[PDB]
Short mmCIF file of C-alpha atoms in Angstrom, two decimals:
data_model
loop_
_atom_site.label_atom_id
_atom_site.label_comp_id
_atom_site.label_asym_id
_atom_site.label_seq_id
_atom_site.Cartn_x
_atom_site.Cartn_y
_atom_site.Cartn_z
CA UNK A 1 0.00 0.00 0.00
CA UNK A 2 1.45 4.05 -0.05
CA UNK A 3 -0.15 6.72 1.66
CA UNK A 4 0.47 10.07 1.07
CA UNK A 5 0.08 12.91 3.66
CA UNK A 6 -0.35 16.73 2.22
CA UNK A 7 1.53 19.54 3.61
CA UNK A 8 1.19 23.33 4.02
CA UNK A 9 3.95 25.63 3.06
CA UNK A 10 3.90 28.67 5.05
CA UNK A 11 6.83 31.24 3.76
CA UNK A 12 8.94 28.18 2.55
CA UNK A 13 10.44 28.30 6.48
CA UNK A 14 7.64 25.71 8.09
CA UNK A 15 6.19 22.51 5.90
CA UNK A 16 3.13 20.99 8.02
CA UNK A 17 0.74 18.52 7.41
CA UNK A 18 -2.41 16.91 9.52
CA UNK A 19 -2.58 13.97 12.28
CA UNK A 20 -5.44 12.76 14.19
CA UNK A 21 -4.77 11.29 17.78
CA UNK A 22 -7.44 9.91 19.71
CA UNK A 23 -11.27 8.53 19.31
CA UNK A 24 -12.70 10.55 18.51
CA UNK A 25 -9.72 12.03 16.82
CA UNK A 26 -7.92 15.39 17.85
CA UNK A 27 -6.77 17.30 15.19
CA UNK A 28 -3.33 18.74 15.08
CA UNK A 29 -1.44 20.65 12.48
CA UNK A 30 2.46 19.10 12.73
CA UNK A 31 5.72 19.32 11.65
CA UNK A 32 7.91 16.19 10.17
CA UNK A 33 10.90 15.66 11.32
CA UNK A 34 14.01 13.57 9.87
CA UNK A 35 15.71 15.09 12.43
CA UNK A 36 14.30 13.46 15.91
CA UNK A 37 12.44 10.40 16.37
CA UNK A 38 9.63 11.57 19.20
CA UNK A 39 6.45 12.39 18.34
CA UNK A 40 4.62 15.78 20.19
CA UNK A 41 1.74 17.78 20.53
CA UNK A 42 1.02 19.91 23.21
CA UNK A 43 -1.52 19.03 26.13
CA UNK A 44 -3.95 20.41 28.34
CA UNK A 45 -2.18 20.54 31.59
CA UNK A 46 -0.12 22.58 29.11
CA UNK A 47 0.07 26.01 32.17
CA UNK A 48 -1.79 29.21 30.38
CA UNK A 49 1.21 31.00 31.40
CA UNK A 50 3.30 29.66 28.50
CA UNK A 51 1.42 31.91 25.70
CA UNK A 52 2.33 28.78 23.22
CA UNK A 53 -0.31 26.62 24.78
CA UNK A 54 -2.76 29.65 24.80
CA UNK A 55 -1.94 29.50 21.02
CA UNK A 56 -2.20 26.21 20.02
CA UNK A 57 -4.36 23.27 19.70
CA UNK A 58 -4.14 21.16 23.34
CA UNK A 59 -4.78 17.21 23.49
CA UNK A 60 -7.02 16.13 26.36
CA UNK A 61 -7.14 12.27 27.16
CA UNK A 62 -10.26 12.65 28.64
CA UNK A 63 -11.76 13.29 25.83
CA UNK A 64 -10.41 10.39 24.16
CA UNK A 65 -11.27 6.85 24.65
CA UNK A 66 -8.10 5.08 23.54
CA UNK A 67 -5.82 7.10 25.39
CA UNK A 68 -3.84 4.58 27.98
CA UNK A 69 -1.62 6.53 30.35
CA UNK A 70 1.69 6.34 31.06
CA UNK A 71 3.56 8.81 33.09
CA UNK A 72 7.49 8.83 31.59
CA UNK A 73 9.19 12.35 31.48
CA UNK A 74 10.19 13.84 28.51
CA UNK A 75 13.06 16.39 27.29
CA UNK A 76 13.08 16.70 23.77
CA UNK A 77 16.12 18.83 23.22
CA UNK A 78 15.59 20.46 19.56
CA UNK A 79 18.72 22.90 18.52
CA UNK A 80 16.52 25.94 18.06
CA UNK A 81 14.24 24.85 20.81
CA UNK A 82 13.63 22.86 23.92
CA UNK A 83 9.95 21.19 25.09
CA UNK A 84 8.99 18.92 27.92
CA UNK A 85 6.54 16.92 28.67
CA UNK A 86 5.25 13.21 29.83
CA UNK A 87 5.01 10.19 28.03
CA UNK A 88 1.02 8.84 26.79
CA UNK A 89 -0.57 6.48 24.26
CA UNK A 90 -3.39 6.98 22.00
CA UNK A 91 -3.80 5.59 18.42
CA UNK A 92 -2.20 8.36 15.85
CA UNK A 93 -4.03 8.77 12.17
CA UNK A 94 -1.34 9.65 9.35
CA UNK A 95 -3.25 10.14 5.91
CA UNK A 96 -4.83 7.07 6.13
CA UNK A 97 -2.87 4.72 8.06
CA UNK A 98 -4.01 4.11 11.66
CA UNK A 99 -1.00 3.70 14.54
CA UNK A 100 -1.13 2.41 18.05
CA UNK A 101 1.14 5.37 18.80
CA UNK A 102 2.73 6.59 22.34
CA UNK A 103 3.67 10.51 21.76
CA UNK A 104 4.68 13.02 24.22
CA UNK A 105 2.14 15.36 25.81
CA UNK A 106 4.01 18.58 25.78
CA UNK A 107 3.57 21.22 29.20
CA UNK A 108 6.42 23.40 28.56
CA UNK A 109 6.73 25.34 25.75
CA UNK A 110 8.82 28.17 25.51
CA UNK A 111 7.51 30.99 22.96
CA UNK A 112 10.55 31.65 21.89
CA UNK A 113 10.29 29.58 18.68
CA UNK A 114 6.97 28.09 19.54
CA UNK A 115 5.28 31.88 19.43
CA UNK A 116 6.26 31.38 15.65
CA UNK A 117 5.35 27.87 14.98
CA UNK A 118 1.91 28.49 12.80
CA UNK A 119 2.11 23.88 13.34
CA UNK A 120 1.20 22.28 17.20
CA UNK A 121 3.86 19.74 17.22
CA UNK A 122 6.31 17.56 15.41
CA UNK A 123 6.07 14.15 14.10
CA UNK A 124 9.99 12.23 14.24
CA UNK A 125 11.15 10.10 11.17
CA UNK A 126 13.92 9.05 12.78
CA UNK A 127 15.80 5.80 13.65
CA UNK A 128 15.44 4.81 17.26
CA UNK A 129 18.77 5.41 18.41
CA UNK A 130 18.32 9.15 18.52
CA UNK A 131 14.86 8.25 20.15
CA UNK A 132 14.67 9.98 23.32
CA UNK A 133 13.32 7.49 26.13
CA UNK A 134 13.52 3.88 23.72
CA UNK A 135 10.32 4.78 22.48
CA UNK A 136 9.51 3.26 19.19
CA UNK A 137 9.02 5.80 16.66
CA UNK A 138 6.02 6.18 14.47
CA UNK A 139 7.58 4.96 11.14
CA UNK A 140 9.19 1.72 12.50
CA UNK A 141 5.68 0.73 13.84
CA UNK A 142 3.77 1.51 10.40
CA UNK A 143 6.72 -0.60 9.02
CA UNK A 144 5.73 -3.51 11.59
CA UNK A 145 2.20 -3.54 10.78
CA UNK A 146 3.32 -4.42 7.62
CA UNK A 147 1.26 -2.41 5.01
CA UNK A 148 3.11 -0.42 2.83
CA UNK A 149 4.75 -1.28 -0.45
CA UNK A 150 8.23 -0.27 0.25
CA UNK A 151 10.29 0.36 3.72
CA UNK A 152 10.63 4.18 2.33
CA UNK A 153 9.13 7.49 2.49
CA UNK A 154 9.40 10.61 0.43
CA UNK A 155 9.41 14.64 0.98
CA UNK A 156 8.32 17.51 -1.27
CA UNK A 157 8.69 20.69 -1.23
CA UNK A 158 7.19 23.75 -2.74
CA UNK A 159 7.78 26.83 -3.61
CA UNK A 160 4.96 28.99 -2.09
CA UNK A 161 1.42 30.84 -3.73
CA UNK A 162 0.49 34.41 -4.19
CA UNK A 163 -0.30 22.70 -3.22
CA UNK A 164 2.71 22.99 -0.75
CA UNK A 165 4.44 20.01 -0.79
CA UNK A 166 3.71 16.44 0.24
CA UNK A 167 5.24 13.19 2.05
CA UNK A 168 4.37 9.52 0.30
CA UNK A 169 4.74 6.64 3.25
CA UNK A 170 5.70 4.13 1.21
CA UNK A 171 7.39 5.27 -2.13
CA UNK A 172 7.78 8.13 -4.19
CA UNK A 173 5.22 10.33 -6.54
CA UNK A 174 6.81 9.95 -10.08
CA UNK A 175 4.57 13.94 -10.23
CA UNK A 176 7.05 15.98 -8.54
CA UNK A 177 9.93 15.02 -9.61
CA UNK A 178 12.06 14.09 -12.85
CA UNK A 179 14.85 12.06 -14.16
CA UNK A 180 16.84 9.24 -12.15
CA UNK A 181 16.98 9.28 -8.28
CA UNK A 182 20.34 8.64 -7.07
CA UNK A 183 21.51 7.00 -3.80
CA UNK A 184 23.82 7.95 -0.69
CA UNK A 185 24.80 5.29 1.63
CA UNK A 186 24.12 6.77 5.41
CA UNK A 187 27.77 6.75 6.91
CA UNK A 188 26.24 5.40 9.94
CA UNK A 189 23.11 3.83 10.66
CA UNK A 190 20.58 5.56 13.14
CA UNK A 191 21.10 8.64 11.50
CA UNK A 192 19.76 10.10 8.14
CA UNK A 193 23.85 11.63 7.83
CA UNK A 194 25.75 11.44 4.94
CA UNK A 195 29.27 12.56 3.95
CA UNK A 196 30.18 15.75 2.01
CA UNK A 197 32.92 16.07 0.02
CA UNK A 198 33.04 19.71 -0.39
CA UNK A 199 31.10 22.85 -0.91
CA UNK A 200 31.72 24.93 -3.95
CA UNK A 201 31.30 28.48 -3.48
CA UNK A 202 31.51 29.49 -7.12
CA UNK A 203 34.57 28.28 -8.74
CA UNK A 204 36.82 28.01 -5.71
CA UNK A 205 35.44 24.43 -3.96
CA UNK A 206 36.29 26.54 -0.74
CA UNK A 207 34.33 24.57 1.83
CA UNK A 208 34.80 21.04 2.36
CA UNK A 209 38.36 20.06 2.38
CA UNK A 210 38.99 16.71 3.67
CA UNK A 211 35.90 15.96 4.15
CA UNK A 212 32.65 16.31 6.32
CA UNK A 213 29.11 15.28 7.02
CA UNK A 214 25.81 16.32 6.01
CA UNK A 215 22.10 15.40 7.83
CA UNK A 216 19.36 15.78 5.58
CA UNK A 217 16.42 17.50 7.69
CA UNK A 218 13.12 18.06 6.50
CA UNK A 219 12.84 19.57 10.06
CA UNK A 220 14.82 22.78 9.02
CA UNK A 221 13.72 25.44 7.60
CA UNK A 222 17.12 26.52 6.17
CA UNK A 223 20.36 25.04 4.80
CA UNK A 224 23.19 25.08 7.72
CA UNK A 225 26.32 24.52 8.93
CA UNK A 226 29.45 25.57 11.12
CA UNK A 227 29.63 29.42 12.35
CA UNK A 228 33.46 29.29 10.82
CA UNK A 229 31.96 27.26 7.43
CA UNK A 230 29.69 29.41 6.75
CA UNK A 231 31.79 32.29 7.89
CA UNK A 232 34.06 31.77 4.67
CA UNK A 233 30.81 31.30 2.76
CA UNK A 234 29.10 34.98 3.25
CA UNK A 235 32.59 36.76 3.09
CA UNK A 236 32.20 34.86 -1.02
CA UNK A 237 28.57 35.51 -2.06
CA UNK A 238 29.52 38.67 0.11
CA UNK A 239 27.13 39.13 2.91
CA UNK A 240 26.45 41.25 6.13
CA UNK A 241 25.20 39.86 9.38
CA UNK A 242 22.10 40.53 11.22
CA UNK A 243 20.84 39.13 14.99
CA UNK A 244 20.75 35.46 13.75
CA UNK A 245 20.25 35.64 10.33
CA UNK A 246 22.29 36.97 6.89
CA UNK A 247 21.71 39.22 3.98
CA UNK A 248 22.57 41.30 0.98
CA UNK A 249 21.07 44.00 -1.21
CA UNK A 250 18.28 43.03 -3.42
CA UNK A 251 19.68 44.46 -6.27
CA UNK A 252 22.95 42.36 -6.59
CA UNK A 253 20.82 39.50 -5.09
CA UNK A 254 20.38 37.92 -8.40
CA UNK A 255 23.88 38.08 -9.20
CA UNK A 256 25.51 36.10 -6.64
CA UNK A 257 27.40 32.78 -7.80
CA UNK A 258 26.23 28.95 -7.98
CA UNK A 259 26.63 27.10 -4.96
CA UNK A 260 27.31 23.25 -5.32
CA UNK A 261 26.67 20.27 -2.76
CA UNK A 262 28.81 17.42 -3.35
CA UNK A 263 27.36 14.32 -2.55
CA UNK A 264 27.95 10.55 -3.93
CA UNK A 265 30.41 11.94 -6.72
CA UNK A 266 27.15 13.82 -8.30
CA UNK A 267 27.10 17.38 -7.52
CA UNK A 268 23.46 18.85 -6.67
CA UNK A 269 24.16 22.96 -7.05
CA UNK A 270 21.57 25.34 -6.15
CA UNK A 271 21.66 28.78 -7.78
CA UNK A 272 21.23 32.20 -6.10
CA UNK A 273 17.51 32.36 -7.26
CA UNK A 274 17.00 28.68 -5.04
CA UNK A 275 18.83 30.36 -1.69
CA UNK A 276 18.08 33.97 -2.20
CA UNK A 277 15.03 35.80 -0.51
CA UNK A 278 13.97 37.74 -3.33
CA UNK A 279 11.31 39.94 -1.84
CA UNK A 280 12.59 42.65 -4.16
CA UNK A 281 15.50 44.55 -6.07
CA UNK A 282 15.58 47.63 -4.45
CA UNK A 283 18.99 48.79 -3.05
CA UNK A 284 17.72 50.66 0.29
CA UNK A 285 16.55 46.89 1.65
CA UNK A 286 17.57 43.86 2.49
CA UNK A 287 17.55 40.40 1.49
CA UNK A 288 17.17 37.17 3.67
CA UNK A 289 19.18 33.95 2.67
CA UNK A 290 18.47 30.84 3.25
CA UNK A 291 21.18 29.68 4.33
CA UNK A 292 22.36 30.20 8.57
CA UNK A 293 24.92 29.37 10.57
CA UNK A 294 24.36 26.93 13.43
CA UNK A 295 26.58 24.94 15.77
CA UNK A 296 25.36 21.61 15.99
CA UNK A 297 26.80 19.60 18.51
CA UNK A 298 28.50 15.57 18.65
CA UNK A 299 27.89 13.17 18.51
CA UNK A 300 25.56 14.25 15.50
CA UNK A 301 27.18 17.39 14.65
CA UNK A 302 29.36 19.03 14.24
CA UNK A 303 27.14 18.84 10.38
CA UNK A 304 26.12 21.00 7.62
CA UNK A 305 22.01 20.60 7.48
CA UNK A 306 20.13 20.40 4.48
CA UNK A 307 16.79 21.53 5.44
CA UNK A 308 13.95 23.27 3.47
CA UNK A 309 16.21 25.63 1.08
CA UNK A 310 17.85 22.11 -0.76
CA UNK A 311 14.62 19.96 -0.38
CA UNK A 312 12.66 22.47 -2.51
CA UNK A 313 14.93 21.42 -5.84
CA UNK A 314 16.00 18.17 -4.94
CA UNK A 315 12.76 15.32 -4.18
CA UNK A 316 14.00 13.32 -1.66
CA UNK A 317 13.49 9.40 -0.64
CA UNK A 318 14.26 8.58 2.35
CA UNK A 319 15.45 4.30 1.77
CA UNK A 320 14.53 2.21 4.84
CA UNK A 321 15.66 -0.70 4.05
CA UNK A 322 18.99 -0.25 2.14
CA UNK A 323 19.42 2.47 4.43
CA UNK A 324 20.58 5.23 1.67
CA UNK A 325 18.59 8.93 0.72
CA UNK A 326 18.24 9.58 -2.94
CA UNK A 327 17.79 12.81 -4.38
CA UNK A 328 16.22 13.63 -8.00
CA UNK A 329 15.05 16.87 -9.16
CA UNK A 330 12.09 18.00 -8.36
CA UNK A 331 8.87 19.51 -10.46
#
């Protein structure tokens, strides 16, 4: 069987599409993850103080009938955000398929990022070894029950309106995207991380040299890596620094050079239209890129991230049972 699950795309920085936990079901608006392997939503005993909770959708178990406690604290620690909460099992609904699922009900949220989250929670599609607490995640037990066509999944991402993107448990939609895929190996296993051998900032390959690794997360709304890395990188498309984010002027936007990913011998590039905010050409404002700076921590990091900025042009398959991603272009 494949089932395919329909996201949102909400200023190509957050992807979400729709779960259902309980019976009757509680609908929440989520986030999914190749990054961690927990699933959350926030909950009811969720304090009012924490203007998250006031914000978003809260699961009660009281108003569901499959709900069977547990009481197990949780610490998910995210790198742009932290959220804690107590273990809990219900029976999850993802487009179609139907889970015995135990999630995480969330009671501290801190606004800072959650203010800005326009999703509830996060769904992890993750191995279990990064799964905080044992706890089985959601794709292994789809996988168990033994109803898909293929130990695989598949992302797709849009670029915006004025449909988003989508995720096939599964397989792949042969719709949005074009050509051959092409496989990775993971370097280890437990981890969607693959090596890198080098960056190319134009003509000079001037970021990669030896050697390094790269985590493909759908869970990130930019591409990133080192503070130095990417330090090298801006002072080459030429760029100017801002609280916790980078820019340039509008005008010369559309001029900056090619930058290339190298990965299994192929090299997947991404021009400055694919990185670049455009929101305009004027030379009295700014620019965002997509593209930040963020120190990511062993045993995972330290690792560039290729989040939402590289997913957009590249389809990508995430291979279950060879372990291996495979990218393809996208339509």
């Amino acid at each position: 069987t494949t089932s395919s699950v329909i996201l949102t795309n909400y200023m190509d920085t957050q992807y979400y599409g729709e779960i259902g936990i309980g019976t009757p079901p509680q609908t929440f608006k989520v986030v999914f993850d190749t990054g961690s392997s927990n699933v959350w939503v926030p909950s009811s005993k969720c304090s009012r103080l924490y203007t998250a909770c006031v914000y978003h959708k809260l699961f009660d178990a009281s108003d569901s009938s499959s709900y069977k406690h547990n009481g197990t604290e949780l610490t998910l620690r995210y790198s742009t955000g932290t959220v804690s909460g107590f273990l809990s099992q219900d029976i999850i609904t993802v487009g179609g398929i139907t889970v015995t699922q135990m999630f995480g009900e969330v009671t501290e949220m801190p606004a800072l990022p959650f203010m800005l989250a326009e999703f509830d929670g996060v769904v992890g599609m993750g191995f279990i070894e990064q799964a905080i607490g044992r706890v089985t995640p959601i794709f292994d037990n789809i996988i168990s029950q033994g109803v898909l066509k293929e130990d695989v999944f598949s992302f797709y991402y849009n670029r915006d309106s004025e449909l988003g993107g989508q995720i096939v448990l599964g397989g792949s939609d042969p719709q949005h995207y074009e050509g051959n895929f092409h496989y990775i190996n993971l370097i280890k296993t437990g981890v969607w991380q693959i090596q890198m051998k080098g960056v190319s900032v134009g003509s000079s390959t001037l970021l990669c040299e030896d050697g390094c690794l790269a985590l493909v997360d759908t869970g990130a709304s930019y591409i990133s890596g080192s503070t130095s890395s990417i330090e090298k990188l801006m002072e080459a498309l030429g760029a100017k620094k801002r609280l916790f984010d980078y820019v340039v002027k509008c005008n010369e936007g559309p001029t900056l050079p090619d930058i290339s990913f190298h990965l299994g011998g192929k090299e997947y590039t991404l021009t400055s239209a694919d990185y670049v905010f455009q929101e305009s050409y004027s030379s009295k404002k700014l620019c965002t890129l997509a593209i930040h700076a963020m120190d990511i921590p062993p045993p995972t990091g330290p690792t560039w991230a290729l989040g939402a900025t590289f997913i957009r042009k590249f389809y990508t398959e995430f291979d279950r049972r060879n372990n291996r991603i495979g990218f393809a272009l996208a339509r």
